[PDB]
Design a protein around this ligand. Structure first.
Ligand SMILES: [Br-]
Ligand SMILES: [Br-]
Length: 232
């Protein structure tokens, strides 16, 4: 089962690439599934079964993506794990769906409802209007259940409203690393004299890696595909 030439190839890879994380798994669980998958392809033993030799695969991610979210997760392999600290400086892009009228303790659709306000007076123009208060250098309080927290300075490069089907508004956001999309959605609901929480959250870009162009689907989580897409 061991394929020695493929094993050499796997352990020779070093750089950064991106994968597509589906909704459901944590970022740690996805890294574990990806690590076990590549080792099994080469026929190498599990990490709990390595002989403490140099033939130990090194892998990690460069910016966490929560369980309920989807999209780009940056992965470092080989000595490329030493590059991941610098990957945090890159800007991010999200597509988020907020739901007016309902607030939750987690600020998304997984938590428990904490508040209900009407939203029938909110028009699409009303939303487009207050988006500029959230564009540029803004103050933002992090979500309570994130790791309350003190307000922190964050950067929003662009926000656009793609769709409004009350109560659901879909936002396209280009922002800095430390920006919280859940905070933005909750505050947009407040600023419109209502409330809101995140129904769906897709990270479409982190740094130089976009979901549209770079993110490897699961069927391409192979030694050869990763080699071809690696950024040394
Ligand atoms: Br930021
Ligand atoms: Br968030």
């Amino acid at each position: 089962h061991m394929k020695a030439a493929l094993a050499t190839k796997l352990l020779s890879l070093s750089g950064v690439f991106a994968v597509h994380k589906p909704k459901g798994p944590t970022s740690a669980e996805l890294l574990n599934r990806l690590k076990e998958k590549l080792l099994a392809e080469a026929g190498m033993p599990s990490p709990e079964w390595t002989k403490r030799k140099k033939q130990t695969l090194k892998i990690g991610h460069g910016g966490t993506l929560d369980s309920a979210a989807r999209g780009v997760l940056v992965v470092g392999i080989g000595s490329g794990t030493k590059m991941l600290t610098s990957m945090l400086s890159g800007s991010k892009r999200y597509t988020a769906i907020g739901e007016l009228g309902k607030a939750t303790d987690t600020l998304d659709s997984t938590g428990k409802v904490t508040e209900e306000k009407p939203y029938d007076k909110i028009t699409q123009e009303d939303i487009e209007g207050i988006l500029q208060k959230f564009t540029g250098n803004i103050m933002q309080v992090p979500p309570l259940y994130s790791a309350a927290k003190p307000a922190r300075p964050v950067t929003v490069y662009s926000i656009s409203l793609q769709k409004f089907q009350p109560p659901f508004f879909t936002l396209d956001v280009e922002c800095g690393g430390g920006f919280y999309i859940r905070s933005l959605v909750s505050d947009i609901g407040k600023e419109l004299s209502s409330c809101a929480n995140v129904l769906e959250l897709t990270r479409t870009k982190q740094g130089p890696f976009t979901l549209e162009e770079h993110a490897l689907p699961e069927d391409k989580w192979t030694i050869d595909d990763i080699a071809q897409s690696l950024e040394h």
